[PDB]
Structure formats: C-alpha cells, structure tokens
Design a protein around this motif. Structure first.
Motif, PDB file in Angstrom:
ATOM      1  N   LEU A 161      -3.912   3.984   4.014  1.00  0.00           N
ATOM      2  CA  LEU A 161      -4.856   3.091   3.347  1.00  0.00           C
ATOM      3  C   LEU A 161      -6.291   3.423   3.723  1.00  0.00           C
ATOM      4  O   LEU A 161      -7.194   3.342   2.882  1.00  0.00           O
ATOM      5  N   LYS A 162      -6.526   3.796   4.985  1.00  0.00           N
ATOM      6  CA  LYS A 162      -7.889   4.150   5.386  1.00  0.00           C
ATOM      7  C   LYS A 162      -8.397   5.380   4.646  1.00  0.00           C
ATOM      8  O   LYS A 162      -9.621   5.553   4.500  1.00  0.00           O
ATOM      9  N   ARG A 184       4.727  -4.333   6.181  1.00  0.00           N
ATOM     10  CA  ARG A 184       5.142  -4.479   7.568  1.00  0.00           C
ATOM     11  C   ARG A 184       6.028  -5.712   7.676  1.00  0.00           C
ATOM     12  O   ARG A 184       5.733  -6.741   7.065  1.00  0.00           O
ATOM     13  N   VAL A 213      -0.169  -5.191   3.074  1.00  0.00           N
ATOM     14  CA  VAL A 213      -1.458  -4.701   3.546  1.00  0.00           C
ATOM     15  C   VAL A 213      -2.091  -3.917   2.405  1.00  0.00           C
ATOM     16  O   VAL A 213      -1.477  -2.987   1.879  1.00  0.00           O
ATOM     17  N   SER A 268       2.210   3.577   6.024  1.00  0.00           N
ATOM     18  CA  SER A 268       1.436   3.064   7.148  1.00  0.00           C
ATOM     19  C   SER A 268      -0.016   2.915   6.721  1.00  0.00           C
ATOM     20  O   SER A 268      -0.447   3.448   5.700  1.00  0.00           O
ATOM     21  N   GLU A 269      -0.777   2.207   7.556  1.00  0.00           N
ATOM     22  CA  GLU A 269      -2.173   1.903   7.269  1.00  0.00           C
ATOM     23  C   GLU A 269      -3.085   3.115   7.386  1.00  0.00           C
ATOM     24  O   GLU A 269      -4.185   3.093   6.826  1.00  0.00           O
ATOM     25  N   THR A 270      -2.676   4.159   8.118  1.00  0.00           N
ATOM     26  CA  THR A 270      -3.450   5.397   8.132  1.00  0.00           C
ATOM     27  C   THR A 270      -3.690   5.907   6.715  1.00  0.00           C
ATOM     28  O   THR A 270      -4.775   6.404   6.398  1.00  0.00           O
ATOM     29  N   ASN A 272      -5.539  -2.074   0.487  1.00  0.00           N
ATOM     30  CA  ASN A 272      -6.899  -1.552   0.425  1.00  0.00           C
ATOM     31  C   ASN A 272      -7.542  -2.230  -0.785  1.00  0.00           C
ATOM     32  O   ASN A 272      -7.317  -1.835  -1.933  1.00  0.00           O
ATOM     33  N   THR A 330       0.434  -0.892   1.651  1.00  0.00           N
ATOM     34  CA  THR A 330       1.561  -0.686   2.553  1.00  0.00           C
ATOM     35  C   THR A 330       2.076  -2.063   2.977  1.00  0.00           C
ATOM     36  O   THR A 330       1.736  -3.091   2.372  1.00  0.00           O
TER      37      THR A 330
END
Length: 138
Positions: free
Chosen positions: A107-108, A116, A121, A103-105, A123, A114
């Motif tokens: 990547l942050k 979808r 997606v 999930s993108e959490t 970074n 990630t």
C-alpha cells in the motif's frame, strides 16, 4: 491470516460487478475455486517462477483474460522482491486496475487494499482515484 475466500468476498464488496480478476502466483511458494464459485468472480492465475517471468505473465492476464484487478496472495519469495512488487503496482496502475495485496508494504508503494485478522486497510488516495468506496459497515 485472512483466507482467500474472505479476501475475494471483500473484493466483491469493494468492486461490485467485478467479473474477472488476475492472480500473479509464485510457483515456488508454499501451497480459490470455491472462492471463485462462491463469489461468481472468475479467478485467472498466472504463475511465475522468476523475476523475468513477471512482466510476460502479467501482460497475458490483460491480453487474453481482460482482468479488472490484480490480486496477490503472499510474498514469501519472488513476490517479496521490491522489483516484482514495484513492477506489478506500476503496471497495474497504468492499466487502470487496482491491486489487492498481502501486506501494507504494498500500500505504501501504491497498492489499493490489504487486510488483517478481519479489518480492511486502504490506501485512501488510490481507492478514491480508482472509484472504490469502502462500505460504511467496514
């Protein structure tokens, strides 16, 4: 959901010539061979049942198996804990390994890629430092 074989083929395209990848797997999650065989990438799974197992198991992926990236497939329990996620991202990054995450959490916090349902997606800052170019067609 993007299936594991779709994920590993995407990894193969982002890291041509990757040969060995490490998976950290939550033993208590619900539910790779065809993925590994279809891609030609050796998949080494290290299972963890609690937070105190995450560090020893991660370091065995590196010591015994010379993995070139970390792959996490889900985050329903232990791998949903901030402390597990932060440990894995920080130590993989220190070791020079990208993290492919669910999930993108992630990547942050510094994971690299990630996905979808399939769209990627990325970074961008991490992929660039890691030497990862996103294919033009993607």
């Amino acid at each position: 959901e993007v299936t594991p074989i779709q994920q590993l083929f995407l990894i193969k395209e982002l890291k041509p010539g990757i040969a060995r990848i490490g998976v950290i797997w939550d033993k208590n999650a619900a539910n790779l061979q065809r993925a590994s065989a279809a891609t030609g990438i050796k998949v080494v799974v290290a299972e963890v049942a609690s937070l105190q197992e995450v560090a020893p198991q991660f370091r065995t992926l590196l010591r015994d198996h010379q993995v070139e990236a970390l792959w996490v497939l889900e985050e329903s329990g232990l791998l949903g804990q901030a402390a597990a996620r932060s440990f894995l991202i920080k130590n993989a990054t220190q070791a020079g390994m990208p993290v492919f995450a669910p999930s993108e959490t992630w990547l942050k916090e510094g994971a690299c890629v990630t996905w979808r349902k399939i769209r990627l997606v990325v970074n961008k800052a991490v992929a660039e430092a890691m030497g990862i170019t996103i294919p033009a067609k993607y």
